[PDB]
Amino acid sequence: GTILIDLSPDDKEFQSVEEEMQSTVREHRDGGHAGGIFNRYNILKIQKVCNKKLWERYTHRRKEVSEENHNHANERMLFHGSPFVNAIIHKGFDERHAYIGGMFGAGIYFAENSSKSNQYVYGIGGGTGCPVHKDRSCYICHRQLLFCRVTLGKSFLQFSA
Amino acid sequence: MAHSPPGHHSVTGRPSVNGLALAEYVIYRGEQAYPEYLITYQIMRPE
Ligand SMILES: O=c1cc(-c2ccccc2)oc2ccccc12
Numbered sequence: 054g055t056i057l058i059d060l061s062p063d064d065k066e067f068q069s070v071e072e073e074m075q076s077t078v079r080e081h082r083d084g085g086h087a088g089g090i091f092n093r094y095n096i097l098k099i100q101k102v103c104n105k106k107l108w109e110r111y112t113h114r115r116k117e118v119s120e121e122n123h124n125h126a127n128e129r130m131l132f133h134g135s136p137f138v139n140a141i142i143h144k145g146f147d148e149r150h151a152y153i154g155g156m157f158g159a160g161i162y163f164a165e166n167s168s169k170s171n172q173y174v175y176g177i178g179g180g181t182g183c184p185v186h187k188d189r190s191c192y193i194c195h196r197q198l199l200f201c202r203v204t205l206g207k208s209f210l211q212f213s214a
Numbered sequence: 215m216a217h218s219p220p221g222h223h224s225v226t227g228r229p230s231v232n233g234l235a236l237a238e239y240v241i242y243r244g245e246q247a248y249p250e251y252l253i254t255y256q257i258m259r260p261e
């Protein structure tokens with residue numbers, strides 16, 4: 054049920070998504086081990102993901118959270134990086150996409166820093182890097198991130214090193 | 215998959231050492247996220 058619509062680089066929607074990608078890059082405490090050494094990206098394509106069933110799945114739950122939190126979904130746009138991006142865009146997020154060993158328990162993790170999500174694209178800790186060169190810092194191979202609408206509702210605040 | 219803390223819908227990982235780190239978030243229900251954009255890209259070697 055999923056279709057992918059390309060955005061033209063001229064579409065202001067392409068431009069605002071690119072700007073969130075680029076402007077939320079940071080340096081990482083691992084010196085680039087997990088995700089590679091870079092200060093910015095070359096954006097090859099941005100596609101709108103359309104799936105009516107998955108969208109209605111999202112908005113149904115959104116209204117439930119909202120109704121439990123004085124009509125405030127507390128909705129954000131956040132990045133997700135995963136080896137399972139293709140299963141995610143076709144079948145939606147579920148338990149198979151959770152980070153069992155995450156610092157806040159076994160859930161589905163999202164980042165404000167694009168460069169944080171980039172560290173997970175080839176797996177946990179960058180896995181063994183790109184399929185073709187086994188290079189966590191590969192400058193050649195094409196990577197994919199998701200920029201996601203996430204309902205946070207009432208969020209438990211965890212201060213954390 | 216775990217559960218949200220009782221009375222909450224998500225967890226926020228507030229950065230607490232690295233002053234430049236932004237927040238990270240966790241949801242415990244797949245239906246609380248919709249993947250709006252698929253972005254294809256390369257990281258670039260710094261000059
Ligand atoms: O974008 C993120 C993606 C993942 C991830 C972890 C395990 C399996 C699949 C994806 O982990 C993160 C952890 C922190 C912040 C962002 C992310």
Ligand SMILES: [Zn+2]
Nearest residue numbers: 183186191194
């Ligand atoms: Zn490669």
